[PDB]
Design a protein around this nucleic acid. Structure first.
Ligand code: NA
Length: 91
DNA sequence: AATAAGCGGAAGTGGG
DNA sequence: TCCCACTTCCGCTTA
């Protein structure tokens, strides 16, 4: 089953939900969610995973926060903005 | 107030 | 047994 950071990286590469997520500085791996359109992306994540409940942005961000300690994704001090690690980007 | 972003402890679910 | 990789729930804090 795909991991959340990989789902997000794949979306950014495909551009399939450009109104929900975008690169800020792709060389640094920083990206940002849409305030108004992030829920549609969260819904897609839950459906891809086959979860029992509807996925929300709040629950998806709860999962994202767990990557802070291992480093795959870190929160940036800007609204709705995060940063992939170099290791994640290189793979 | 209304709305929104951000946080994380705790317990539950999946698939090894 | 016991960790993976989240998911779900709940209460709190700041803007
Ligand atoms: Na929000």
């Amino acid at each position: 089953k795909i991991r959340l950071y990989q789902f997000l990286l794949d979306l950014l590469r495909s551009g399939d939900m450009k109104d929900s997520i975008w690169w800020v500085d792709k060389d640094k791996g920083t990206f940002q969610f849409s305030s108004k359109h992030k829920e549609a992306l969260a819904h897609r994540w839950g459906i891809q995973k086959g979860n029992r409940k509807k996925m929300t942005y709040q629950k998806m961000a709860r999962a994202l926060r767990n990557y802070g300690k291992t480093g795959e994704v870190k929160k940036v001090k800007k609204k709705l903005t995060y940063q992939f690690s170099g290791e994640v980007l290189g793979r």
